[PDB]
Amino acid sequence: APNQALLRILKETELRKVKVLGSGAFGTVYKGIWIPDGENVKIPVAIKVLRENTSPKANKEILDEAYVMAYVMAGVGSPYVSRLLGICLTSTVQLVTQLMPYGCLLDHVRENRGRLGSQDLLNWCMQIAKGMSYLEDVRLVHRDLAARNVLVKSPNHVKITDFGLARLLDIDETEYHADGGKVPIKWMALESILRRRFTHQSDVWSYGVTVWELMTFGAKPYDGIPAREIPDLLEKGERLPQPPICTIDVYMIMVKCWMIDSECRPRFRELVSEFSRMARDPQRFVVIQ
Ligand SMILES: Cc1cc(Nc2ncnc3ccc(NC4=NC(C)(C)CO4)cc23)ccc1Oc1ccn2ncnc2c1
């Protein structure tokens, strides 16, 4: 039985990096193997190495938040939210989770543009809503929900990751990198763009964009529109168009997620109930070819 207030430290000799999976502003993700000493098991893992030349103020903010969430979620997790297995300390901080062998949901839907099932798409919408409802219940705001930050364990099972990560990068005149990366304007609630306000209700907006990504098999939201134009087009009432495979019932939920009045957006518990109803009767709600 793991002790919820303790941290599991993995020795560097118990971990092997096999492949670079990708990277972002704050670290590099590797596919790896965890072989716990004194056992006869091997665990496929993902290893996120925090960037060495990031400002120490920034890396403390990121790791402190990771710890806070890890201890909040130790008591009881969610099947639909990634779980920290342990950390490896070398010259670098290496955060270790179970490998999700079908990778990023964005890549999964783009690779399978043709052959994905209506019931699977709706089930993933439900599971993402369940993961987000868990984060809201333990008082954690995601701040960067997107199809790139949902992982595929199997066609039966997705998990949210990279929650409570996104933040302004502290920078210096001469030392460290100054690559804060691009602001994900095209996923953000208007109040997040205008006022840097991030709440459970701005997560609901991003959830709407994530569902749109899934239902379009990974189309790029507002493709070809300069970021500077986004807040004005949102205030004028322009929105992402209805995905061809969707009924109006599904699109009405997406549009409610993008209400300027955050209090008019759905609650994650309502999104769980709506997508559970639709996943049960998929032929009523989504039609592929
Ligand atoms: C260790 C770690 C791993 C991941 N990511 C993956 N994880 C698992 N399987 C995967 C399979 C494929 C891909 N592919 C892929 N990801 C891109 C870089 C986007 C492009 O290509 C990624 C993962 C995300 C975050 C992360 O860090 C934490 C830290 C703390 N906590 N606490 C609870 N959860 C975490 C997670």
Ligand SMILES: [Cl-]
């Ligand atoms: Cl678009």
